[PDB]
C-alpha cells in the first residue's frame, strides 16, 4: 500500500492520472520523481522547467555541478540526483527529442531506467515538447516498465484520449 490517490489502473503495475506532476510530488513526497531531462540537464521548459522552478532553482544548481563533473548524459540514459523539496530522489531520464531528430527507438531504453526503482512518479517520456506521440509513449511504458509507475498527465484532454484509446 502507498499514498498515491485517484489513479486509474491500466495494468498490474502502471497507473495513470490527469495531474500536474509538480503538485503531485509536493503532496505525495514520493521516493522517486522522474524528470523529463535533456543530456545537459538544462531544465528550461516542460516538466523539467516546472520541477526546477518548484525547487527554487536548486535542481539546476545541483545539475550544473553534476555535468561539470561527469559530462552530458546519453539519450536513453539517466542519473539519480536529489529530489529537493519534491521527493527523496529525482531520476533524470533522457527520452529522445523528436524535435531534435533523435531516434524514437531510444524511448524503450529510456523507460528501462525505471526498472531500477520499485515505485516512481513519472511523466510520459518524450511527450509534450519532446515531440513524440503520447499514445506511443504510454504503450512503450506499459511494455517496458515492470516496477510500479504512477503516471501524471498534465493535459486533461490528452489524458482522456490516452485512457479511451488504451488497449
Ligand atoms: C505528457 C506531458 C508532456 O508530460 C504533459 C503534457 C503537458 C505538460 N506535461 C506535464 N505532465 C505532468 N506534469 C507536468 N507539470 C508541468 C508540465 C507537465
Amino acid at each position: 500500500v502507498n499514498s498515491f490517490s485517484g489513479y486509474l489502473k491500466l495494468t498490474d503495475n502502471v497507473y495513470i492520472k490527469n495531474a500536474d506532476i509538480v503538485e503531485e510530488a509536493k503532496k505525495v513526497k514520493p521516493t522517486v520523481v522522474v524528470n523529463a531531462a535533456n543530456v545537459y540537464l538544462k531544465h528550461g521548459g516542460g516538466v523539467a522547467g516546472a520541477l526546477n522552478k518548484a525547487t527554487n532553482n536548486a535542481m539546476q544548481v545541483e545539475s550544473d555541478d553534476y555535468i561539470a563533473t561527469n559530462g552530458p548524459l546519453k539519450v536513453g540514459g539517466s542519473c539519480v540526483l536529489s529530489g529537493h523539496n519534491l521527493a527523496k530522489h529525482c531520476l533524470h531520464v533522457v527520452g529522445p527529442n523528436v524535435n531534435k531528430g533523435e531516434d524514437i527507438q531510444l524511448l524503450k531504453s529510456a523507460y528501462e531506467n525505471f526498472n531500477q526503482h520499485e515505485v516512481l512518479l513519472a511523466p510520459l517520456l518524450s511527450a509534450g515538447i519532446f515531440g513524440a506521440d503520447p499514445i506511443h509513449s504510454l504503450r512503450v511504458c506499459v511494455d517496458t516498465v515492470r516496477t510500479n509507475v504512477y503516471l501524471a498527465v498534465f493535459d486533461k484532454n490528452l489524458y482522456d484520449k490516452l485512457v479511451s484509446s488504451f488497449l
Side-chain angles (χ1 to χ4, degrees), residues 140-153:
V140 177
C141 180
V142 163
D143 295 341
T144 305
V145 181
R146 298 177 301 282
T147 55
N148 289 328
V149 57
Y150 289 84
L151 293 168
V153 179

Side-chain angles (χ1 to χ4, degrees), residues 32 36 64:
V32 180
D64 287 351

